[PDB]
Each structure stands twice: as C-alpha cells, then as structure tokens.
Design a protein around this ligand. Sequence first.
Ligand code: P1X
Ligand code: ZN
Length: 341
Amino acid sequence: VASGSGEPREEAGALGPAWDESQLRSYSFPTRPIPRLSQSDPRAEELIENEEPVVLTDTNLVYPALKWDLEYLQENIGNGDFSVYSASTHKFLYYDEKKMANFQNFKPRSNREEMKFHEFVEKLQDIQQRGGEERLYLQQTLNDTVGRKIVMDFLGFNWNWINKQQGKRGWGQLTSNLLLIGMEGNVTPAHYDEQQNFFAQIKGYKRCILFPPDQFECLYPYPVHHPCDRQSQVDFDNPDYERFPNFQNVVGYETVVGPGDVLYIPMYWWHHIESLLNGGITITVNFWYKGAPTPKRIEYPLKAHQKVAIMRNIEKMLGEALGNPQEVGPLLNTMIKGRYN
Ligand SMILES: O=C(O)CNC(=O)c1ncc(-c2cn(CCCc3ccc(Cl)cc3)nn2)cc1O
Ligand SMILES: [Zn+2]
C-alpha cells in the first residue's frame, strides 16, 4: 500500500486535514514517501544534483498564482485558443498525433479540442449541473497572448530561484510552461519525460507517484513509434501480470503536493499523477528544461536513464533503416530468440 502516502498535512489556522486518504486511489504496489524539505536545506540541493525527487515547500516559485481560481482566470487570461482534452474516464491517456499515422488500429479515447477559456468553464459548469461523468483536462503552454493581470503574475514568479537551479545543474533552456487545470479524480497515467521538470502546484492537491528509470523493466512502455510513446502499457487499475509480470516488482516514491509545493521530477523518472477524488479543481504549472548535456568521454557503468536513451535510439534507428516502424518488432525478436534469451 501507500506507506509513502503520508499522514495528511494539517493546514495552518487549524482549518482541518487538507485531505484524507479516502481521496487517494487504491493500487497494488508499495510506496515510500518523497521528502518534503525547505529550499535552504542542503539535503534538498543534493537530491536535485543527484537527480532524485524532492518536494520543495517554500520556493515562492509561483506565489502570485496562488490567488488563481477559475473566475480570476476567465476575466484576465484573454481570448486565446486553449487545448482541452476530453475523456470517458478518470484516465487521460494522451496520443502523439504525428506518430498517429503509423498505427491506425489503436483507436483514440481522449481527444483535443480548442476552446476559449469561457467555453471550457462553460463545459465544467454544465457537466457540473447535469452530474455528467465526462471529464476534462485543460493543458496549454501560456504565451504572451494572455491578459495584463496574468503577465504580471507570471513576472512575479521567483525566476531568481529557478534560474539559479538551471545554472547550478548545467541544464539547458526552459522549453515550456504548461498550465494544467483538471477535475477531481482525473488521472494522468504513468509516463516519463525526457526533461528535468519543476512541477509547481497552485490550487488543489495532486498525488504524484514516481518511479526511478531503473524500473523500466516493470513498467513496459509502448514502442517508441507508437502514439503512447513513453507511457506505461500497464493499467494501474487492473494490471495484466501475465503480459507484464515484472509490474509485481514495482515500488514507487509517492507524495501529495498542494498549493505552494514544488515537486522536482528528474528527467526520465516515471510519474503517475492524480487529482485527489472530491478535492475539486486542480491547477498546476510546469517548468521543463532540457537537461544537462552529456559529457564528452563517458563514465561507466552507465546510469539507467542513459540505457533508456540508448534503447530509444535503437528503436528510432531501426525504424528509419527498415523504412517502416512496424518492422521494428519482428526484427528485434528474430535478433533475440534463442540468441540472447
Ligand atoms: O497531470 C499532471 O499533473 C502531470 N502531467 C504531465 O506530467 C505531462 N507530461 C507530459 C505531457 C506531454 C505532452 N506532450 C505533448 C507536447 C508537449 C510537451 C513536450 C515536451 C515535454 Cl517534456 C512535455 C510536454 N508530451 N508530453 C503532458 C502532461 O500533462
Ligand atoms: Zn509528464
């Protein structure tokens, strides 16, 4: 179970338990808790330099955004196009649409749709009213388009702190700034990203379950050329242990983040994210940085994330070299069977 869940944190002014574990979903693997530390704490600077997850609790990274809510955003964000994904269920499986023309026989069960902010809230209001079970997840990189109040907020982020982290870790350019607004219960299934991430919680509480790259074997990512590249094939809600036996060996690092917490998700680390049930609307901003460049002459034994990049590159080479990504599997199997297995 979630031994790493944590005894819920008690909010100041004794306004109750921020959340209780009945708002966490039930899963078949154990976990240990991610450390919640202060930014000044050197234990937390060492966790980051060693690419290990840590919850930073007092960065003020997005202090101005803590006032955010739907009303405030609607009135001040502009008339921009905001990507919004629909879903039949709590699970939000996402598809790379450009990879979409390889496989045609894995149909789409979560779809994008541009909206103006007022229409999005519109949709939640009516879904709200009719008690519907459709779920929505807004996910959009904010850009200069936005309102005057929201540019001032963005400018009030603690750029000095994060910009220092980018330099101290030798990381590369901030790639993007997604904003996520999601409904209670919504789940982003387990996946890994190729970039260092600072996951900055604003409104609501999110449960984050991470796994290290070295548990690649237990999480069974889709093929690289598949639309669900970098997602785990394993249904966390009902695992198929015959197809994925080593998911019985998976142990996670877990934590619940709330307003003001910043969760460092090291690159290539798996993460599963859920907005707690009956916790209402969640709001997050993410800060993705190209990771540090790989030194010129490499140190063995390699680290797990480098082996992952290798496997990824093998799949990519073979896809181009064979003229068809769908021959990758067959060739790899003939390479292995009775030779390496
Ligand atoms: O639900 C939560 O709180 C946690 N959600 C996530 O972590 C999350 N992670 C990754 C993606 C994602 C989206 N795309 C499509 C192109 C955008 C892009 C490009 C590069 C990178 Cl590095 C990230 C994003 N590719 N990856 C979406 C997510 O929502
Ligand atoms: Zn991610």
